[PDB]
Amino acid sequence: EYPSAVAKARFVRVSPRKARRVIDLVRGRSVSDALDILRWAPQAASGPVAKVIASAAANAQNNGGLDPATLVVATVYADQGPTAKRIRPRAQGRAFRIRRRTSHITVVVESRP
């Protein structure tokens, strides 16, 4: 029904929840609307997302031969990426485990006239 183009970014150093709180603004919206929204998104963690969405439309345009004007974002994932751990020293010698969480963002797009 929707022969969508697939694009995704693995190993991004932005947490999934911080991705999701932006992604919720771009469900069922056009690519150009999403790109403008993210351009002016005060959360300022949308950069990677705009790059991925842009690459999805560009790839659909060149490999698929589709027109961005009708290209709409269908499904967006903010999957949990690989996580490392770091030790911080706190009071009384307590060694706490502090992590650096990542994400795998998967986006599919398709013309929906």
């Binding site: 709180r21 932006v22 919720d24 609307d33 403008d36 351009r39 002016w40 998104a41 005060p42 959360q43």
Partner: protein
């Protein structure tokens, strides 16, 4: 005061859901060359050309 019991998934996700962003945008803002899209807050700057990409 420390957490006595863990919170049920059905309540935790409610707290996760009441943490959303606002929606502001504006179309029709013609500038030199291509007509882009900006917010009302900054449309005057766009009209004066004080924007970048």
């Amino acid at each position: 005061a420390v957490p006595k019991r863990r919170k049920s998934r059905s309540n935790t996700r409610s707290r996760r859901s009441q943490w959303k962003a606002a929606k502001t945008e504006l179309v029709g803002v013609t500038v030199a060359g291509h007509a882009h899209k900006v917010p009302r807050r900054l449309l005057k700057a766009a009209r004066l050309g004080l924007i970048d990409f």
